[PDB]
Design a protein around this ligand. Sequence first.
Ligand SMILES: [Hg+2]
Ligand SMILES: [Hg+2]
Lengths: 157, 157
Amino acid sequence: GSMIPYQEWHSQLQSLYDSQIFHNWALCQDVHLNDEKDGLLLRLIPTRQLLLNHIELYLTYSKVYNEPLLLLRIWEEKSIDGIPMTKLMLPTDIESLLDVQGKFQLGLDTIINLEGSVWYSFHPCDTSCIVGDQAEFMSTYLRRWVSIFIFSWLGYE
Amino acid sequence: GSMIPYQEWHSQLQSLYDSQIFHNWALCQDVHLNDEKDGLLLRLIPTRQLLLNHIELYLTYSKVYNEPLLLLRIWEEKSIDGIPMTKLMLPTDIESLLDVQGKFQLGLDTIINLEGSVWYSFHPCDTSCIVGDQAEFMSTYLRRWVSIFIFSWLGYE
Ligand SMILES: [Hg+2]
Ligand SMILES: [Hg+2]
């Protein structure tokens, strides 16, 4: 693990949102900042290999672990009896959709339930990669975290 | 959170098991150390508020967060059409059982899937109360954690 304090997360999250980085990301359909500005929902544009899908990322702060928490869910279209239908993708399939690159998902399967909605805790790696010995680089934590936890499996380009 | 490295967790867990603190605990039906001595299963004696329940606690280590995880599930006997039957308890009720006495859970509702079994990750609070400050008390740390995460809502006896 790592630690970034909440005040630092809050600030960097607003700064990131303001930067327009997600707004000008061509992948990204729309961006939303929660009321507390604690959290950010990204909706990716329709993707087939990355029968179309729609990917949702909820960027949040875990107050228990003091680290960002990336919540994942995916809408899949599926032909049922010849009829196109939409369902929420099941985790084991999310595990296939992805590893095809980044074959490793860390730790234990973890479903986060948000007011009735089911999300996947996304953990390709240990967030401790992001910090150095002395925490010198704290100011860019979130930005670099984005590169590792998001851009790495969904290319900016 | 307050991180503890796997080496120290592993030692203290095996050490905790040795003290027989769980074996002589009145509430405890049985204690099992997983094959790797990584994790510890506690089955508790039949209770209702402390047709009866059966509570299971799995003490494990998160490599993602470098913190212990208390995994929790509960067998409740319900009377269905007049016939006693058992079921795994729903999280809302696990809350309304624990949450009433009392009284808290931090963060989002987290479900953990172990080889198909469903566990509710139990966080009465952040672990940042357990250590810090050059950590002269690190060695205890699992013992403090047990006091805060387990004995607080169960009661040592
Ligand atoms: Hg990493
Ligand atoms: Hg605490």
